[PDB]
Design an enzyme around this catalytic site. Structure first.
Site, PDB file in Angstrom:
ATOM      1  N   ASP A  81      -1.740 -17.961   3.633  1.00 20.45           N
ATOM      2  CA  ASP A  81      -0.761 -17.436   2.685  1.00 20.45           C
ATOM      3  C   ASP A  81       0.488 -16.929   3.380  1.00 20.45           C
ATOM      4  OD1 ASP A  81       0.016 -16.917   0.032  1.00 20.45           O
ATOM      5  OD2 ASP A  81      -1.294 -15.138  -0.216  1.00 20.45           O
ATOM      6  N   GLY A  88       0.212  -9.338  -7.371  1.00 19.25           N
ATOM      7  CA  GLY A  88      -0.768 -10.338  -6.954  1.00 19.25           C
ATOM      8  C   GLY A  88      -1.985 -10.450  -7.855  1.00 19.25           C
ATOM      9  N   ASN A  89      -2.712 -11.579  -7.718  1.00 15.57           N
ATOM     10  CA  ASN A  89      -3.928 -11.893  -8.475  1.00 15.57           C
ATOM     11  C   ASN A  89      -5.179 -11.384  -7.740  1.00 15.57           C
ATOM     12  N   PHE A  90      -6.305 -11.200  -8.492  1.00 12.30           N
ATOM     13  CA  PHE A  90      -7.644 -10.722  -8.065  1.00 12.30           C
ATOM     14  C   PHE A  90      -7.676  -9.256  -7.591  1.00 12.30           C
ATOM     15  N   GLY A  91      -6.698  -8.881  -6.761  1.00  5.84           N
ATOM     16  CA  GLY A  91      -6.570  -7.539  -6.215  1.00  5.84           C
ATOM     17  C   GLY A  91      -5.176  -6.951  -6.312  1.00  5.84           C
ATOM     18  N   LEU A 126       2.338  -1.539  -5.716  1.00  6.23           N
ATOM     19  CA  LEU A 126       3.106  -2.417  -4.833  1.00  6.23           C
ATOM     20  C   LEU A 126       2.610  -3.845  -5.190  1.00  6.23           C
ATOM     21  CD1 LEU A 126       2.362  -0.375  -1.581  1.00  6.23           C
ATOM     22  CD2 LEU A 126       4.531  -0.261  -2.786  1.00  6.23           C
ATOM     23  N   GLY A 127       1.294  -3.915  -5.436  1.00 10.17           N
ATOM     24  CA  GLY A 127       0.435  -5.034  -5.809  1.00 10.17           C
ATOM     25  C   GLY A 127       1.042  -6.411  -5.892  1.00 10.17           C
ATOM     26  N   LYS A 175      -5.613  -1.115  -0.853  1.00  9.15           N
ATOM     27  CA  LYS A 175      -6.004  -2.328  -1.561  1.00  9.15           C
ATOM     28  C   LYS A 175      -7.408  -2.207  -2.164  1.00  9.15           C
ATOM     29  CE  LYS A 175      -5.944  -7.378  -1.117  1.00  9.15           C
ATOM     30  NZ  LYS A 175      -5.252  -8.457  -0.351  1.00  9.15           N
TER      31      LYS A 175
HETATM   32  C1  LIG Z   1       2.444  -7.884   1.467  1.00 13.54           C
HETATM   33  C2  LIG Z   1       1.794  -7.268   0.244  1.00 13.54           C
HETATM   34  O1  LIG Z   1       0.381  -7.279   0.432  1.00 13.54           O
HETATM   35  C3  LIG Z   1       2.219  -5.820  -0.018  1.00 13.54           C
HETATM   36  C4  LIG Z   1       1.771  -5.401  -1.406  1.00 13.54           C
HETATM   37  O2  LIG Z   1       2.518  -6.103  -2.389  1.00 13.54           O
HETATM   38  N1  LIG Z   1       1.620  -4.938   0.983  1.00 13.54           N
HETATM   39  C5  LIG Z   1       2.181  -3.868   1.433  1.00 13.54           C
HETATM   40  C6  LIG Z   1       1.471  -3.226   2.481  1.00 13.54           C
HETATM   41  C7  LIG Z   1       0.121  -3.650   2.972  1.00 13.54           C
HETATM   42  N2  LIG Z   1      -0.438  -2.941   3.956  1.00 13.54           N
HETATM   43  O3  LIG Z   1      -0.425  -4.650   2.495  1.00 13.54           O
HETATM   44  C8  LIG Z   1       2.088  -2.187   3.127  1.00 13.54           C
HETATM   45  N3  LIG Z   1       3.307  -1.684   2.916  1.00 13.54           N
HETATM   46  N4  LIG Z   1       3.942  -2.284   1.852  1.00 13.54           N
HETATM   47  C9  LIG Z   1       5.147  -1.836   1.363  1.00 13.54           C
HETATM   48  C10 LIG Z   1       5.453  -2.556   0.238  1.00 13.54           C
HETATM   49  C11 LIG Z   1       6.674  -2.396  -0.604  1.00 13.54           C
HETATM   50  C12 LIG Z   1       6.894  -3.224  -1.709  1.00 13.54           C
HETATM   51  C13 LIG Z   1       8.058  -3.101  -2.462  1.00 13.54           C
HETATM   52  C14 LIG Z   1       9.016  -2.153  -2.123  1.00 13.54           C
HETATM   53  C15 LIG Z   1       8.799  -1.315  -1.043  1.00 13.54           C
HETATM   54  C16 LIG Z   1       7.638  -1.430  -0.289  1.00 13.54           C
HETATM   55  C17 LIG Z   1       4.381  -3.502   0.045  1.00 13.54           C
HETATM   56  C18 LIG Z   1       3.451  -3.323   1.072  1.00 13.54           C
END
Ligand SMILES: C[C@@H](O)[C@@H](CO)Nc1c(C(N)=O)cnn2cc(-c3ccccc3)cc12
EC number: 2.7.10.2
Length: 277
Positions: free
Chosen positions: A131, A17-20, A14-15, A41
């Site tokens: 952010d 992003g940088n560093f993590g 899903l990431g 994460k």
């Molecule tokens: C805001 C960002 O930190 C993102 C990670 O890129 N974080 C996600 C989280 C999280 N708990 O950080 C949870 N559900 N969550 C769902 C998605 C996602 C991303 C693309 C398509 C569908 C779902 C992304 C996240």
């Protein structure tokens, strides 16, 4: 609250992003693909500065309990990752572009009000997010949003209202652009840009980047940050989004007051957004 690593089955990234990075995992203790999905994460970079930044994010998130803040689930143990809930709808930025036609102004005001109550709560815990952007807000359901990505979040010491410290420059407050000063008032500036994103449905063609770079033009040798800052000091702002209700645009302009002291508080913004609906 404690997830065994061998039970966390990797699915995708899903990431973005940088560093993590943030991965979609299934917490599958039975090993049969039936367990709950979780967002996990981890910091890709090791060391005694990034691990401090990672423990701080864990501690901040673990202590936050709000309907408008991504839920902490635990940490992992293996032969350390941060375990949070997974929101299948994903980020508000993409959600607004996929469902543009069914999201009217009242719906955008509901998301705005929810984000605001989440930030009011963050402020009450002395947390500066740093952010706040549509890409960092998650969709829980049709009528519910939550604030995520606490990787840059800092706790304000008891005797200070600000903090002195890599994201697109178009969300920063003038004082953060000029002196790297961050506070609840700079989170308010960022919120003004979130209202702009919402009322543009995160359309890329009138995005804060496209619209500000177009307004900045092209400086002879002056760097882009200095240019944006000269544009902001001059009183120039992002234009009212197309079909934007006038009152919403007036709220954005208040979030964008040059001096941090003149910007409304999240507590002051909340009733104003509720009144609009
Ligand atoms: C805001 C960002 O930190 C993102 C990670 O890129 N974080 C996600 C989280 C999280 N708990 O950080 C949870 N559900 N969550 C769902 C998605 C996602 C991303 C693309 C398509 C569908 C779902 C992304 C996240």
């Amino acid at each position: 609250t404690i997830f065994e690593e061998r039970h966390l089955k990797y699915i995708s990234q899903l990431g973005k992003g940088n560093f993590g990075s943030v991965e979609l995992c299934r917490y599958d203790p039975l090993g049969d693909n039936t367990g709950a999905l979780v967002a996990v994460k981890q910091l890709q970079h090791s060391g005694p500065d990034q691990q401090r930044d990672f423990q701080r994010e864990i501690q901040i998130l673990k202590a936050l309990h709000s309907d408008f803040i991504v839920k902490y689930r635990g940490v992992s143990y293996g032969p350390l990752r941060l375990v949070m809930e997974y929101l299948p709808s994903g980020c508000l930025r993409d959600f607004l572009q996929r469902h543009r036609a069914r999201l009217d102004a009242s719906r955008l005001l509901l998301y705005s009000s929810q984000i605001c109550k989440g930030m009011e709560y963050l402020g009450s815990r002395r947390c500066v997010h740093r952010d706040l952007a549509a890409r960092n807000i998650l969709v829980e359901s049709e009528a519910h949003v939550k604030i995520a990505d606490f990787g840059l979040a800092k706790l304000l010491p008891l005797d200070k209202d600000y903090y002195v410290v890599q994201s697109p420059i178009f969300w920063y407050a003038p004082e953060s652009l000029s002196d790297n000063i961050f506070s609840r008032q700079s989170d308010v500036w960022s919120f003004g840009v979130v209202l702009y994103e919402l009322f543009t449905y995160c359309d890329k063609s009138c995005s804060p980047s496209a619209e500000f770079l177009r307004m900045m033009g092209s400086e002879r040798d002056v760097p882009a940050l200095s240019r944006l800052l000269e544009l902001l000091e001059e009183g120039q702002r992002l234009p009212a989004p197309p079909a934007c209700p006038a009152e919403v645009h007036e709220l954005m302009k208040l979030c964008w007051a040059p001096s941090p002291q003149d910007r409304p508080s999240f507590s002051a913004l909340g009733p104003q957004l509720d009144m609009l609906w």
